[PDB]
């Protein structure tokens with residue numbers, strides 16, 4: 720029924736979507752256009768081997784990773800902006816906020832990375848490039864296996880055929896996780912998330928007539944994520960210990976260590 724309570728939920732869906740569009744330049748809608756040749760906007764350069772990598776650019780493995788950590792950080796900005804737009808979020812203790820975002824960003828990042836991914840590879844540099852999945856593998860060990868798990872996550876996640884409107888609400892649901900280590904006011908965070916979770920369930924029901932237990936099937940991805948993120952850190956521990964010669968951006972090093 721279209722009661723006042725649902726109306727308010729739909730308002731919450733719309734606010735969140737509008738904020739997401741303002742904070743997130745490359746939306747999934749834009750990405751998929753590019754990826755399907757539907758766009759008439761400039762086609763991206765395709766890094767599929769060493770040659771095309773060098774021509775696109777106008778050690779390798781290390782360069783790519785150091786470029787990704789620069790995006791890894793611009794992303795964390797984007798995210799932070801959006802998180803602040805979530806109703807209730809700023810009216811939380813500033814030390815709960817920093818916590819939710821410390822433990823949350825990476826989940827969001829890999830959620831949204833999936834928007835830029837197909838079977839073949841990933842869009843990069845805000846739509847201007849595309850790096851092939853097989854190429855990111857062919858990177859020398861241990862750098863050959865840091866994305867593979869994200870591509871594995873992405874192909875399953877993308878099967879759900881979530882749109883930007885869905886992902887808006889879902890990303891909020893994650894950020895307001897009521898079980899991050901070192902949370903003072905847990906009751907408020909859970910109270911907002913309850914509200915978001917109602918919003919998301921209703922959004923999904925409306926937007927996905929074909930597919931039941933999607934809401935279910937989505938929340939299960941929250942788990943796949945936390946796993947991916949763990950395994951990513953464990954690799955970063957190995958890399959940091961293998962290649963104690965390169966430099967790891969200090970802001971990531973604050974997040975990763977806890």
Ligand SMILES: O=C(O)Cc1cc(I)c(Oc2cc(I)c(O)c(I)c2)c(I)c1
Pocket residue numbers: 745786787788790791794828832835841842843844845846865866951
């Ligand atoms: O966690 C990790 O494995 C590291 C990582 C993080 C991001 I974020 C990536 O995705 C992008 C998206 C855009 I847009 C870019 O411009 C670039 I460079 C990388 C990739 I690949 C790898």
